[PDB]
Short mmCIF file of N, CA and C and ligand atoms in Angstrom, two decimals:
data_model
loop_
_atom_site.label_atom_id
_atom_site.label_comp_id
_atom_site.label_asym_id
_atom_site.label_seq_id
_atom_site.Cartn_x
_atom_site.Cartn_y
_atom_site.Cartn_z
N UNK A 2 -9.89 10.01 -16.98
CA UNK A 2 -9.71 11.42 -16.70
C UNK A 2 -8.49 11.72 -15.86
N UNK A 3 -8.56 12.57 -14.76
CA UNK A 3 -7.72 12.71 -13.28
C UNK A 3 -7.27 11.37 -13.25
N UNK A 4 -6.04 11.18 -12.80
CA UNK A 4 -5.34 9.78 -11.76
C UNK A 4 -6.11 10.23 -10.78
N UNK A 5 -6.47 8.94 -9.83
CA UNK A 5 -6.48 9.12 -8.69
C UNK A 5 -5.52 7.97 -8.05
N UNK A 6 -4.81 8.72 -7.13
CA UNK A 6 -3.33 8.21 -6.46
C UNK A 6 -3.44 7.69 -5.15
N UNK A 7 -2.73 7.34 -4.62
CA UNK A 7 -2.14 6.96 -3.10
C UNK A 7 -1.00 6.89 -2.47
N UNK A 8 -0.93 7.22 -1.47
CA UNK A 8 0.02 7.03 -0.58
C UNK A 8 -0.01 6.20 0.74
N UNK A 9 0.31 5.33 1.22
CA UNK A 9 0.21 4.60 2.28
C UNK A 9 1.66 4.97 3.56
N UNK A 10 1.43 6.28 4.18
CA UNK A 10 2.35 6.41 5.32
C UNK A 10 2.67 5.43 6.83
N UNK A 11 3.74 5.47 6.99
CA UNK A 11 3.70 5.34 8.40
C UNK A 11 4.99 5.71 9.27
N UNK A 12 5.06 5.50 10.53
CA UNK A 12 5.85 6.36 11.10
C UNK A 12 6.45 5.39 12.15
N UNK A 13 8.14 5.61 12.23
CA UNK A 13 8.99 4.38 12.95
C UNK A 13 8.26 3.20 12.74
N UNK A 14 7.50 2.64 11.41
CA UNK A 14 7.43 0.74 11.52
C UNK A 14 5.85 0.93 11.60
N UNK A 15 5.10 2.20 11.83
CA UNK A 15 3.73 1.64 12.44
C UNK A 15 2.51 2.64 11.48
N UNK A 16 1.80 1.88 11.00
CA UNK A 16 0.94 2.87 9.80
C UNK A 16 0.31 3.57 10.24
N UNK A 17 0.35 4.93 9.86
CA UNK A 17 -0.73 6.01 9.95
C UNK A 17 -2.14 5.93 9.11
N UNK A 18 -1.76 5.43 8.17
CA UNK A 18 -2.88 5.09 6.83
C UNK A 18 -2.82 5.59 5.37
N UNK A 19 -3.86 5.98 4.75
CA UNK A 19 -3.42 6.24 3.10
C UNK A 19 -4.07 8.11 2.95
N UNK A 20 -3.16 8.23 1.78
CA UNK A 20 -3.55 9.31 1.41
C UNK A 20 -3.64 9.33 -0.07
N UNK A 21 -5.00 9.73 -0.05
CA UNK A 21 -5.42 9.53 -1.47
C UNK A 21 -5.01 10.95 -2.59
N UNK A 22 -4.78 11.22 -3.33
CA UNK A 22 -4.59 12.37 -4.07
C UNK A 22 -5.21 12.78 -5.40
N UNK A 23 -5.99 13.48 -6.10
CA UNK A 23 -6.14 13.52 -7.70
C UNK A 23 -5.19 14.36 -8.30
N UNK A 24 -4.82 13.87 -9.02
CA UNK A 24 -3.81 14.55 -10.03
C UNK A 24 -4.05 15.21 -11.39
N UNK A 25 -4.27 16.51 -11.40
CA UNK A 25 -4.80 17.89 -12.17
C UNK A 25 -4.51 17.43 -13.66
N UNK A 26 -4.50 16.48 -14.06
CA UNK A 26 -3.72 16.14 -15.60
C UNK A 26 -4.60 16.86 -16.58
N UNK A 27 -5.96 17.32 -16.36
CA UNK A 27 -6.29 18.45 -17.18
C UNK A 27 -5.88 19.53 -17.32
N UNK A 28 -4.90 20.16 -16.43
CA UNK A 28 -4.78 21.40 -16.15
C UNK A 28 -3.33 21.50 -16.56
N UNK A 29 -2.25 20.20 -15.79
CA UNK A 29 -1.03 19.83 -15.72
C UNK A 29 -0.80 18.67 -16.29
N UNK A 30 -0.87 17.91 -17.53
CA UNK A 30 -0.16 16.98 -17.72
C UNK A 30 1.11 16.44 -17.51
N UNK A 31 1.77 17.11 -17.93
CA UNK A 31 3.13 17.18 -17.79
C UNK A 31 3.74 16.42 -16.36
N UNK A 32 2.91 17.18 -15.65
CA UNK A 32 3.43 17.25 -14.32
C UNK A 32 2.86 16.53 -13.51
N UNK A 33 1.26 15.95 -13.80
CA UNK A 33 0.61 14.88 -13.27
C UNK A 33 1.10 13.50 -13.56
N UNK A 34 1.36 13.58 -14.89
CA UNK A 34 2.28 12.00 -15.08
C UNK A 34 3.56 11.54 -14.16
N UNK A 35 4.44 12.78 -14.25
CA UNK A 35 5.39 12.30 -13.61
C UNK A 35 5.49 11.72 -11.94
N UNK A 36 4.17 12.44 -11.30
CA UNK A 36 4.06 12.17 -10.33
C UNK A 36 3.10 10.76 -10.37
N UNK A 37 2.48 10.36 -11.27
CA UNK A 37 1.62 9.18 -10.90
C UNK A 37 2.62 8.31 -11.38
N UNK A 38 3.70 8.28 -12.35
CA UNK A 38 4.19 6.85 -12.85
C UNK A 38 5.38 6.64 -11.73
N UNK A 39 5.71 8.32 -10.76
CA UNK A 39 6.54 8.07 -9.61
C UNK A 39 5.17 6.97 -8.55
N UNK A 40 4.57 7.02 -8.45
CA UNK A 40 3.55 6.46 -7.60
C UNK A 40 3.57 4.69 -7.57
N UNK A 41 3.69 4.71 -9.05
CA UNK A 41 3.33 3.27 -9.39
C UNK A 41 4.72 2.73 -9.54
N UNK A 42 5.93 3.45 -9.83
CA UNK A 42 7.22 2.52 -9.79
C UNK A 42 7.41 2.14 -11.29
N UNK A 43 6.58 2.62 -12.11
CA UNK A 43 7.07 1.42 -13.49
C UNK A 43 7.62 1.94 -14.54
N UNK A 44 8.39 3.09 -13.88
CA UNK A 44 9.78 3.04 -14.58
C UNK A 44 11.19 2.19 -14.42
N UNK A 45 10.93 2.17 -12.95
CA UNK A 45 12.02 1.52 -12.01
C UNK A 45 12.42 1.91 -10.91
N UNK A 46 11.87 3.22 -10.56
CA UNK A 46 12.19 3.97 -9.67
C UNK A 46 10.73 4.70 -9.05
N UNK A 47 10.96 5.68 -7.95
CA UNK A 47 9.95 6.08 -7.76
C UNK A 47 9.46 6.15 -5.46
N UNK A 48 8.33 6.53 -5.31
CA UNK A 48 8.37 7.03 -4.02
C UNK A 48 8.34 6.05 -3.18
N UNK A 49 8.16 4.78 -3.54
CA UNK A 49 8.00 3.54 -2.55
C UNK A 49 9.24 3.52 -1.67
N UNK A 50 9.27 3.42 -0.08
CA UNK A 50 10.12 3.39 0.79
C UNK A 50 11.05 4.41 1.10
N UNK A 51 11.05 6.14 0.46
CA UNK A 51 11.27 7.00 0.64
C UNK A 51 10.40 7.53 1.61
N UNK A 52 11.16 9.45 2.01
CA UNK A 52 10.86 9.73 3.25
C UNK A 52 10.06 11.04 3.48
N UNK A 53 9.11 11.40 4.06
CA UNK A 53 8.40 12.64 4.57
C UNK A 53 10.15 13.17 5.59
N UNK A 54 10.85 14.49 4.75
CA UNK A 54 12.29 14.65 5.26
C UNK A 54 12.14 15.72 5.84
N UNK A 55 10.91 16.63 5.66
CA UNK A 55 10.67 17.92 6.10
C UNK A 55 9.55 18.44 6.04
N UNK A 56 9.26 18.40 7.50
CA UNK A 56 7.44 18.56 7.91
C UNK A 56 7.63 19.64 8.69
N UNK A 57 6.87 20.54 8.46
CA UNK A 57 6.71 22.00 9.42
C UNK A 57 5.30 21.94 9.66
N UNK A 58 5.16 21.80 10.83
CA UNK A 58 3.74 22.54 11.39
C UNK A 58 3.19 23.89 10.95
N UNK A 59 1.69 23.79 10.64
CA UNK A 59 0.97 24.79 10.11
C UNK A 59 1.96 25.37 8.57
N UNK A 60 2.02 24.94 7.95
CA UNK A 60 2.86 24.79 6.46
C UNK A 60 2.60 24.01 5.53
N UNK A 61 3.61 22.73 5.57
CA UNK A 61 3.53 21.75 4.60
C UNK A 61 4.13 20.59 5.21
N UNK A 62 3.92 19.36 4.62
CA UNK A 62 5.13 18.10 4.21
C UNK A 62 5.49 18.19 3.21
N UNK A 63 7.12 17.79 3.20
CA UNK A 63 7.67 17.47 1.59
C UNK A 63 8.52 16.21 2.31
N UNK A 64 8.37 15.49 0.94
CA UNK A 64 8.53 14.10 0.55
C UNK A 64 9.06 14.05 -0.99
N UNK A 65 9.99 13.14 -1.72
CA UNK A 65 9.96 12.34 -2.49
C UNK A 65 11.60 12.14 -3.15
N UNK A 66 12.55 12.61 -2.23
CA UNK A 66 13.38 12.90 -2.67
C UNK A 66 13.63 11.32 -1.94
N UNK A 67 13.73 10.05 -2.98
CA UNK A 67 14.40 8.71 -2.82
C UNK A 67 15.16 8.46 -3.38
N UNK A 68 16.59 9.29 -3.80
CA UNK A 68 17.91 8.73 -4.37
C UNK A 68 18.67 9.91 -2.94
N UNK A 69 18.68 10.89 -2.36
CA UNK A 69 19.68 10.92 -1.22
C UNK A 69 18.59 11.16 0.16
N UNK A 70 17.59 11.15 -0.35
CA UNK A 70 16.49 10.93 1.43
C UNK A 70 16.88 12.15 2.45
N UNK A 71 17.59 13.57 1.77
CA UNK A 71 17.72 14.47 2.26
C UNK A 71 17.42 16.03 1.74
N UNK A 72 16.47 16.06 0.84
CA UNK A 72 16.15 16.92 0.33
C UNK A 72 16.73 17.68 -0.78
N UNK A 73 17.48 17.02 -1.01
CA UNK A 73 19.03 17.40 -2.19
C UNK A 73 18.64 16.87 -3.27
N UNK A 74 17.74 15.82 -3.50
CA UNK A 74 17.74 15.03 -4.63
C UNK A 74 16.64 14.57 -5.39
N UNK A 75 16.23 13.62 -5.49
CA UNK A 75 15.10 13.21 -6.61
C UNK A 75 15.51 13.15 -8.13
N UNK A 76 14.70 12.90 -9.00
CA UNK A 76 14.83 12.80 -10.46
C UNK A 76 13.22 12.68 -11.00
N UNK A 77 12.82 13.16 -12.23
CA UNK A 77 11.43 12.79 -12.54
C UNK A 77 11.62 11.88 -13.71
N UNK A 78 10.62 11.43 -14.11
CA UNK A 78 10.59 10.20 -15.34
C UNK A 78 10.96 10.75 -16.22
N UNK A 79 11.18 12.27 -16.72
CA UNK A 79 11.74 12.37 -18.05
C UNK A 79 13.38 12.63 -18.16
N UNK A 80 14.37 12.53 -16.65
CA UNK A 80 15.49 13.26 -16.61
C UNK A 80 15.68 13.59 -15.28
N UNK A 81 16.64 14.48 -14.99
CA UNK A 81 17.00 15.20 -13.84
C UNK A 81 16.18 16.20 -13.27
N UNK A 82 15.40 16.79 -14.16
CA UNK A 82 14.82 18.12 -14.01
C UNK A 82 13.55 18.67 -15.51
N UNK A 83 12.73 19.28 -14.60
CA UNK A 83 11.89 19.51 -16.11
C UNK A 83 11.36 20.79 -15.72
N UNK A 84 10.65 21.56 -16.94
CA UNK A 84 10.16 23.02 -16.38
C UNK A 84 8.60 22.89 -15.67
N UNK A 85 8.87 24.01 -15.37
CA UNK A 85 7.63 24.40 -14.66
C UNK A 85 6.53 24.35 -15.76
N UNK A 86 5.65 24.09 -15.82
CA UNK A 86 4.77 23.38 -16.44
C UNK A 86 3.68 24.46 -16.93
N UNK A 87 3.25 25.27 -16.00
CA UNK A 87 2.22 26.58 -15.70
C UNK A 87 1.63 26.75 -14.04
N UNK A 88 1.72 27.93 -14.21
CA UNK A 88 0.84 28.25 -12.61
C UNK A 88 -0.65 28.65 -12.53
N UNK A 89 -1.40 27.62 -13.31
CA UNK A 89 -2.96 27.50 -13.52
C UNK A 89 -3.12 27.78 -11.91
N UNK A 90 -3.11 26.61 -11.29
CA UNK A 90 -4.01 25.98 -10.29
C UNK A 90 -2.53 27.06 -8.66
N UNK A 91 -3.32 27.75 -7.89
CA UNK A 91 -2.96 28.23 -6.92
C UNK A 91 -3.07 27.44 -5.15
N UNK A 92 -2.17 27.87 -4.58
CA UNK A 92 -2.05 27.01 -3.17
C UNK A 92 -3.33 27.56 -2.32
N UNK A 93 -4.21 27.25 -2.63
CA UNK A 93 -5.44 27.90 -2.14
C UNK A 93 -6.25 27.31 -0.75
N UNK A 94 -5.38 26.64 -0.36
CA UNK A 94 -5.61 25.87 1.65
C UNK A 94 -5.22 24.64 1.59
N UNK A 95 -5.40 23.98 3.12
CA UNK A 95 -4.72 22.82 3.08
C UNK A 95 -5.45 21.98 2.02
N UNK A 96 -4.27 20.95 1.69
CA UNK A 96 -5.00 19.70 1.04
C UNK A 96 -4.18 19.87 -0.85
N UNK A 97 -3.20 21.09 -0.80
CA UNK A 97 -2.97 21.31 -2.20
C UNK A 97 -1.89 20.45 -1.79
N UNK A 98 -1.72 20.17 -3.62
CA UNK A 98 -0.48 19.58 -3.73
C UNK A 98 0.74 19.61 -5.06
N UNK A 99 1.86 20.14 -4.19
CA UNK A 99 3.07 21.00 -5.05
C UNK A 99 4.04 20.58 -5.50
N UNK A 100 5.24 21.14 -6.71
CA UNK A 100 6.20 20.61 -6.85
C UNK A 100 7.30 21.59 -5.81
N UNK A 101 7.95 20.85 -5.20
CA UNK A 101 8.96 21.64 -4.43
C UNK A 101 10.30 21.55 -5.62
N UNK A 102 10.85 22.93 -5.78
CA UNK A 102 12.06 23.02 -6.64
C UNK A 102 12.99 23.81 -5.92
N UNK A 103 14.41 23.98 -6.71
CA UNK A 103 15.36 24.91 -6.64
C UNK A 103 15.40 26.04 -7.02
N UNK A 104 14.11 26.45 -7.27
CA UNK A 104 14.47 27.79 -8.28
C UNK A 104 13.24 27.50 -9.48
N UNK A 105 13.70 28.45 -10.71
CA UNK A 105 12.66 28.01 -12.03
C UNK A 105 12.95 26.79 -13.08
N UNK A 106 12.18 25.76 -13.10
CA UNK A 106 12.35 24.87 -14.18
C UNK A 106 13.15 23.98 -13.32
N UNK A 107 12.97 23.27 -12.06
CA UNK A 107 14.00 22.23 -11.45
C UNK A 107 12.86 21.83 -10.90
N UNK A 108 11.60 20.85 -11.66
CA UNK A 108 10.92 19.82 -10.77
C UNK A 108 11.59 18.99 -10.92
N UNK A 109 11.54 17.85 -9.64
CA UNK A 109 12.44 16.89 -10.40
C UNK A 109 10.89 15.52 -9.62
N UNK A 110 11.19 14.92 -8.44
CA UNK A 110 10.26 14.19 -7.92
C UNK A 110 9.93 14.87 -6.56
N UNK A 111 10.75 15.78 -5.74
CA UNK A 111 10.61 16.43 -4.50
C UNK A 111 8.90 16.94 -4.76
N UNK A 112 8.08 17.05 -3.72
CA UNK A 112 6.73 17.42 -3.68
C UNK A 112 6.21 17.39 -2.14
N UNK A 113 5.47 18.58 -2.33
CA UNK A 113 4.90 18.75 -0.42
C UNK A 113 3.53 18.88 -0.85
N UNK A 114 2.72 18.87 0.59
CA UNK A 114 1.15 18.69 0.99
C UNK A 114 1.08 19.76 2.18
N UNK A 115 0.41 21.02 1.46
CA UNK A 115 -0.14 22.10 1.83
C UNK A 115 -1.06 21.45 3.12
N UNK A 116 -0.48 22.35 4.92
CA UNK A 116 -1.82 21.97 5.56
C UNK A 116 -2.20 23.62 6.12
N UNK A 117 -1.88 24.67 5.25
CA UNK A 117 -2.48 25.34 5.49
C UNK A 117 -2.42 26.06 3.77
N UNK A 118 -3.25 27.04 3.70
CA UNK A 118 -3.49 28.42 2.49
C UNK A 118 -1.34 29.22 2.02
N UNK A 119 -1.20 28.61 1.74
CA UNK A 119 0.09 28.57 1.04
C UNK A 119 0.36 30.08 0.08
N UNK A 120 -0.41 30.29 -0.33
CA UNK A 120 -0.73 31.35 -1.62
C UNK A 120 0.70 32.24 -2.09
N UNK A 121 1.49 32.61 -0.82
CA UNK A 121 2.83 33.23 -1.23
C UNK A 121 3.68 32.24 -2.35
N UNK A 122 3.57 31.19 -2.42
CA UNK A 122 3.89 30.34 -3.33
C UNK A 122 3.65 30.22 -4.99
N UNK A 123 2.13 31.03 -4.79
CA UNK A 123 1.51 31.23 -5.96
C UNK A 123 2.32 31.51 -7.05
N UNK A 124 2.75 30.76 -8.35
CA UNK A 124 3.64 31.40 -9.61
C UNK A 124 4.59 31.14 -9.30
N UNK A 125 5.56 30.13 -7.94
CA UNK A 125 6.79 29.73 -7.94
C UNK A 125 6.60 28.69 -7.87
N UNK A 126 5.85 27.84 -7.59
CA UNK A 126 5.71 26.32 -7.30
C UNK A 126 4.61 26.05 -8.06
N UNK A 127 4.75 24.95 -8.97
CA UNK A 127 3.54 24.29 -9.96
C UNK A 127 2.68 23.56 -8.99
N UNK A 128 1.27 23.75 -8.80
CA UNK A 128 -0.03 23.04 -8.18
C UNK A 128 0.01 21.81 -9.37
N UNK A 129 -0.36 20.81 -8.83
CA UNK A 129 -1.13 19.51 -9.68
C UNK A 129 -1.73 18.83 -9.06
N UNK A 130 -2.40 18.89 -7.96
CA UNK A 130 -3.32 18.12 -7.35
C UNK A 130 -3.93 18.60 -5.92
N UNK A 131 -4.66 17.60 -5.30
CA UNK A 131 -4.96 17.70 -4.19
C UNK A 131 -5.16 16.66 -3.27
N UNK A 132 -5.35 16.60 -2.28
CA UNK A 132 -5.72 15.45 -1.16
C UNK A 132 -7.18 15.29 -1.73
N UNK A 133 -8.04 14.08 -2.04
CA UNK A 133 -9.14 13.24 -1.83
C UNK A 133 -9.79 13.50 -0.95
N UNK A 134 -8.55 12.16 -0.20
CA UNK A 134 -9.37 11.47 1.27
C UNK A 134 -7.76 11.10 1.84
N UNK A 135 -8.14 11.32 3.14
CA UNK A 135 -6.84 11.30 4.21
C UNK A 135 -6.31 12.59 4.90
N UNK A 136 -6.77 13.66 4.35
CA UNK A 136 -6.37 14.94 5.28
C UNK A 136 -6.15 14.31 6.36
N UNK A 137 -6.55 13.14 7.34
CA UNK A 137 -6.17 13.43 8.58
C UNK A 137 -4.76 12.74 9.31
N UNK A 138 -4.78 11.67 7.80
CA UNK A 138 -3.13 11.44 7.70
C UNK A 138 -2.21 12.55 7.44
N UNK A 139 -2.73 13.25 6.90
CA UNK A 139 -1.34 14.14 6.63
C UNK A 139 -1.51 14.98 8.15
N UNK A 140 -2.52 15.18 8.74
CA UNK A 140 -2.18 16.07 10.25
C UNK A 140 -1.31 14.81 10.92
N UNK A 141 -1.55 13.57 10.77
CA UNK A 141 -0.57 12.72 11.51
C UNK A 141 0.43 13.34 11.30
N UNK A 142 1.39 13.22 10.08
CA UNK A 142 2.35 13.46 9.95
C UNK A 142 2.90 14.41 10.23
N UNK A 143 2.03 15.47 9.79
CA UNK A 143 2.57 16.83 10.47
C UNK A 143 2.85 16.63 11.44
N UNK A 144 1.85 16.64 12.72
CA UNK A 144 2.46 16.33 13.96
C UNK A 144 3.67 15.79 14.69
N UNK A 145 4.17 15.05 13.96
CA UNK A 145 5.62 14.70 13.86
C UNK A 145 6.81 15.36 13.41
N UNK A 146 6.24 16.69 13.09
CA UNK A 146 7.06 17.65 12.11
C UNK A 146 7.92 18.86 13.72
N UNK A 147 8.63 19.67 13.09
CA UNK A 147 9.05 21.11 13.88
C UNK A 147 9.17 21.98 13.66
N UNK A 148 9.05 22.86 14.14
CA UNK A 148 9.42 24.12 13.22
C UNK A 148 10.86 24.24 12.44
N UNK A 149 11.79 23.27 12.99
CA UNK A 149 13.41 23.36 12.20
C UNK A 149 12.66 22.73 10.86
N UNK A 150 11.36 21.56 10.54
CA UNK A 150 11.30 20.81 9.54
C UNK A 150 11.80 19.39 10.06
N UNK A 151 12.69 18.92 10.81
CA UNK A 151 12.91 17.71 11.65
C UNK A 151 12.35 17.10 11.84
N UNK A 152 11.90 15.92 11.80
CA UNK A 152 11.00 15.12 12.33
C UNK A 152 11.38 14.49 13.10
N UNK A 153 10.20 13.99 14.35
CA UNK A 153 10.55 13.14 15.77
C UNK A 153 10.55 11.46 15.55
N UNK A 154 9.88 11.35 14.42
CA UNK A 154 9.94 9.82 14.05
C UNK A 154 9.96 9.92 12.48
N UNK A 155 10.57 8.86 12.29
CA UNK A 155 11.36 8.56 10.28
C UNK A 155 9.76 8.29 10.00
N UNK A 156 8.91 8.93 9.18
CA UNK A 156 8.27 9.02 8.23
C UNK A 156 8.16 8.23 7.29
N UNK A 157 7.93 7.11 6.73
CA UNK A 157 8.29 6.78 5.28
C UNK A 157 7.10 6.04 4.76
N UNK A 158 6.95 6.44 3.27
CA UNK A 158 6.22 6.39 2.33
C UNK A 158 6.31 4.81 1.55
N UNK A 159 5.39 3.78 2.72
CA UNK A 159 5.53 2.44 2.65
C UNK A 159 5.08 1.35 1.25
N UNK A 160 3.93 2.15 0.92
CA UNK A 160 3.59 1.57 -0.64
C UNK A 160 2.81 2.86 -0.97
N UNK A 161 2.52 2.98 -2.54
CA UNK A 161 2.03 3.67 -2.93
C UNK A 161 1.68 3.04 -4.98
N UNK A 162 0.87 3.87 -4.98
CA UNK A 162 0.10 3.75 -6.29
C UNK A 162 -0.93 4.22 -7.12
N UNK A 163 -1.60 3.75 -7.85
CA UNK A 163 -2.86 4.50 -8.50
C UNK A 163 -4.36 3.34 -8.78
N UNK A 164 -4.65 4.43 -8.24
CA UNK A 164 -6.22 3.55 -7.78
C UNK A 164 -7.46 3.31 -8.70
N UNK A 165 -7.19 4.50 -10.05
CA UNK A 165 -8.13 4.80 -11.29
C UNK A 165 -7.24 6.12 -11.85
N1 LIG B 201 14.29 18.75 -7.86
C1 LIG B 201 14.53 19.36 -6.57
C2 LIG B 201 13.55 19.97 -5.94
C3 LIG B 201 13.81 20.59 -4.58
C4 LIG B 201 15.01 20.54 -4.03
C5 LIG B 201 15.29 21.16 -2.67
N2 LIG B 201 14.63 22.44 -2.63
C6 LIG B 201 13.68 22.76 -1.61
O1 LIG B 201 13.36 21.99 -0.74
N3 LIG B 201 13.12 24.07 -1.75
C7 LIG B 201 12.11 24.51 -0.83
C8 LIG B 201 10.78 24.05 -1.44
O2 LIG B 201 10.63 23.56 -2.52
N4 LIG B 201 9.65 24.20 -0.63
C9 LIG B 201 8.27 23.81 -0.97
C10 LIG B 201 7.57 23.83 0.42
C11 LIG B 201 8.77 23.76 1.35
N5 LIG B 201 9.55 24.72 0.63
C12 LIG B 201 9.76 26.08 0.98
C13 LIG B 201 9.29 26.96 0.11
C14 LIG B 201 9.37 28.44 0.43
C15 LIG B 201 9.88 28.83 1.58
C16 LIG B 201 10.39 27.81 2.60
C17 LIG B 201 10.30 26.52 2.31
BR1 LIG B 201 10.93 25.18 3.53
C18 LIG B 201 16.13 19.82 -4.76
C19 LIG B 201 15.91 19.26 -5.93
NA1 LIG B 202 -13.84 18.23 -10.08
NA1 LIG B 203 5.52 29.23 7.18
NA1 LIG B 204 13.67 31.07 -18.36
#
């Protein structure tokens, strides 16, 4: 059915723990694949040893941009960029999980983790999943976040994969 995913964070060298995710592939195919075969690496590429680059308190984390590790970049498994998929599933409190883009039709691998009710987002950003288990990793991380989005310690997304 659903992937169910992971993420294994930690922060300057020292683990916070995992974050588990399901990925909406009933709702979003499209857009659930690209994020689970980013998970597992077996294209060749993908989120292993990339960075949580912009964490805002009471907001979101975004993560996955591992070709410039500054929010500029990413790629998804089919190309540079793919469309928006549909806006079924809405940012409806913490624990959602989004494609962050440039605009319409630019997912590429960039993606954040709703820790609060997001909803202004609704119809600009494609939903495909949610947090499991680990909400309280992602308040780790947040916590490390600022309101500039800065973080006080490098973040990075140490292994990751799919669990079923
Ligand atoms: N393929 C690709 C994808 C993205 C990018 C860089 N674009 C980017 O970060 N846009 C911002 C964004 O997606 N998001 C989602 C949550 C954070 N955020 C936000 C949204 C509304 C208002 C304030 C904020 Br902050 C480059 C290439
Ligand atoms: Na369900
Ligand atoms: Na905000
Ligand atoms: Na169009």
């Amino acid at each position: 059915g659903n992937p169910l995913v992971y993420l294994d964070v930690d922060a300057n060298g020292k683990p916070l723990g995992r974050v588990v995710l399901e990925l909406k592939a009933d709702v979003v195919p499209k857009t659930a694949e690209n994020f689970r075969a980013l998970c597992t690496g077996e294209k060749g590429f993908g989120y292993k040893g990339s960075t949580f680059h912009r964490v805002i308190p009471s907001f979101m984390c975004q993560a996955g941009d591992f070709t410039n590790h500054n929010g500029t970049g990413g790629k998804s498994i089919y190309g540079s960029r793919f469309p928006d998929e549909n806006f079924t599933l809405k940012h409806v409190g913490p624990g959602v999980l989004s494609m962050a883009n440039a605009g319409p039709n630019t997912n590429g691998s960039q993606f954040f983790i709703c820790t609060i009710k997001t909803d202004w987002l609704d119809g600009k950003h494609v939903v495909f999943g949610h947090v499991i288990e680990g909400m309280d990793v992602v308040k780790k991380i947040e916590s490390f976040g600022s309101k500039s989005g800065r973080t006080s310690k490098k973040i990075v997304i140490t292994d990751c994969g799919q669990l079923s």
